[PDB]
């Protein structure tokens, strides 16, 4: 839990983002991501999970925290389910459409460096 | 600790701010306030304390978390030491100049409703 988050934070920082872990984000009511990160006018709101399976279920209640967090800010806000698929030694992300249950697989996620590219391409 | 924060959050919400408590903001390194709040393009970064004394010392390390938090956002950012002076049954705030040790008293703080007025007067 703690270790994967610290790893993601370090990867975010090497991409040029300020990134910070939020500690007791528990099943509690508070709209807080596991990690938030900024670079310029972009804010990331991240649920962070690592697994040795090939899929991960994330619950509506947790996804909703990501979105409620973003809605409080006037920055460009991108919510992410960031998953370390340890089988392939890969960080992948899925951008949630809305607050619902989501099964993240290799097929519906992208490599995190692709996300970084999408953000750069928008800078234009 | 928990109860004063929940009270401040409720007061913030009645002023029209989205406000959220951050749980394990401990003497730890993470730049996280006790509470953050937004309304429009303004973000508050708050260290929250209640006391039965007439002064409160806040440490540089804690003040710095407020500021490092704000510096990650492109919103208007106002750091606050929000103190419930229980002797007079009053929430007062001090806006820190910079990261240093600060002794908050009645004399160098203002009523929190005055802070709210200053923000409104700027909207113009």
Swiss-Prot record, chains A, B:
* UniProt-listed Pfam families: Hjc (PF01870)
GO molecular function of the protein, one example? metal ion binding
Which InterPro entries does this chain map to?
A: Hjc, Hjc_arc, Restrct_endonuc-II-like, tRNA_endonuc-like_dom_sf
* Signal peptide residues on this chain, from the entry's feature table: none
According to UniProt, the reaction catalysed is: Endonucleolytic cleavage at a junction such as a reciprocal single-stranded crossover between two homologous DNA duplexes (Holliday junction)
GO biological process: one example: DNA recombination
Please report the name of this protein according to its UniProt entry: Crossover junction endodeoxyribonuclease Hje
């Amino acid at each position: 839990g703690k270790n994967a988050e610290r790893e993601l934070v370090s990867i975010l920082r090497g991409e040029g983002f300020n990134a910070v872990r939020i500690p007791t984000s528990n099943s509690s009511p508070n709209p807080l991501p596991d990690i938030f990160a900024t670079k310029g006018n972009t804010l990331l709101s991240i649920e962070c999970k690592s697994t040795w399976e090939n899929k991960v279920k994330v619950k509506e209640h947790q996804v909703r925290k990501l979105l409620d967090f973003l809605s409080m800010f006037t920055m460009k806000g991108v919510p992410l389910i960031a998953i370390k698929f340890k089988q392939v030694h890969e960080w992948r992300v899925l951008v949630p459409e809305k607050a619902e249950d989501i099964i993240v697989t290799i097929d519906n996620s992208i490599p995190i460096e692709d996300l970084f590219k999408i953000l750069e391409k928008r800078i234009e």
